[PDB]
Design a protein around this ligand. Sequence first.
Ligand SMILES: Nc1ncnc2c1ncn2[C@@H]1O[C@H](COP(=O)(O)OP(=O)(O)O)[C@@H](O)[C@H]1O
Ligand code: VO4
Ligand SMILES: [Mn+2]
Length: 451
Amino acid sequence: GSAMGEPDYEVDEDIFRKKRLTIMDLHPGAGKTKRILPSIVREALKRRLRTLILAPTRVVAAEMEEALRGLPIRYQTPAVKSDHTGREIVDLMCHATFTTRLLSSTRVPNYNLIVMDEAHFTDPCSVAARGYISTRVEMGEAAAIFMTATPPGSIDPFPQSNSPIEDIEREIPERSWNTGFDWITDYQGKTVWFVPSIKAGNDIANCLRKSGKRVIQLSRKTFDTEYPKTKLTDWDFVVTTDISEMGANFRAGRVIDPRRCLKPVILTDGPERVILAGPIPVTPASAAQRRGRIGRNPAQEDDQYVFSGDPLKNDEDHAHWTEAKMLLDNIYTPEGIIPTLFGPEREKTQAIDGEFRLRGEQRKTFVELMRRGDLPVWLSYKVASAGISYKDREWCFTGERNNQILEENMEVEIWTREGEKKKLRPKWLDARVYADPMALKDFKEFASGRK
RNA sequence: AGACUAA
Ligand SMILES: Nc1ncnc2c1ncn2[C@@H]1O[C@H](COP(=O)(O)OP(=O)(O)O)[C@@H](O)[C@H]1O
Ligand code: VO4
Ligand SMILES: [Mn+2]
């Protein structure tokens, strides 16, 4: 037993059994990361199990570190700076870090136990990592624990919370506003506002600042500096991307959730390409997770969740399902077996097994294009599978006329490393490298030979 | 778009 806050002294023997995969689907705020996880880690340490803990984002990693503080854990994330003795048997890293490791030259430790927090995360690297882990368990090589308040098949956006939540539907602004949304700024407590993009976040945060509001912006780009400010400091608004969707303990009073996102989609209407579709409704799991950032405190009884619109359950056209298979078809167990996807996530797209398997140098290029090139999975796969090497940028210029990239209505031109001026006209189109202007600048650098 | 940055 335990009291609130402290880890249970009793841990089920059942969960460490090779061949066992445990899904702990407790409601948000139940204590999965900060009470249950420490109990498992302590017990795995006593059993001398080679253990891996996986967080979706640096936010969840930072929450884990607070709960696991004092235990011999090797943190493999820039969210946590720590003395690594080298003799730790517990590793902690992000989901995508682990998939990256699985795809790279270096060998992953043969973990006896794997704990994945937020095991519903639909990031393609996360789905791929789940495929590998469930294959290790089936092979009797590991035991695994998948922790998630919203496991695959979840459709309720309003699950159980520690404290009552007032759910309110109102219109929520997507951009700056000058009038009409007084309810946003008249509110007394602390607000977490989810935004579909960093750009949209900048706009909104700007707008609240000129209303005398103390605003912390949170994203991949501002995490290191801004996250501790949400902990140790007092603030009015956190304007945040999905970096904060899971795990975060903001101690806030209100969530604002427009329930919108931009989604990458692979088109098959003609030549295959990726577009950024939307804004479209988030999935019920995301709406549930975002709402779950409040009503976490039993002593604080009038938390608010202000939302707009219904969520959308169907995400079969999202690129991540295909991209997860592209990654997984190129990961191998030490026995030589290619993993299959985690059970519940099979047949999300109708993809022939092993149809994304790349040969030799092609697999190395694929990885290079993602890790060094910063290119999406799909584009990286298209380039790699065509037999192009990482440094060969000719594909960026040899597409059909319809592939010409435009910026401010002008045909984008590239000056190459050799001083050639070429029109940017890639053989494969992925809107993720050209839609946002900063993404396009990066892709111009890539096409130039400067990455 | 968002997330990841390890060995
Ligand atoms: N640093 C902290 N100080 C005080 N209370 C906290 C802190 N972090 C989390 N809590 C509380 O402890 C409970 C468990 O949190 P957590 O383990 O993150 O839940 P879960 O991961 O299952 O959503 C939550 O209700 C939260 O309000
Ligand atoms: O189950 V949670 O750590 O996303 O509140
Ligand atoms: Mn958690």
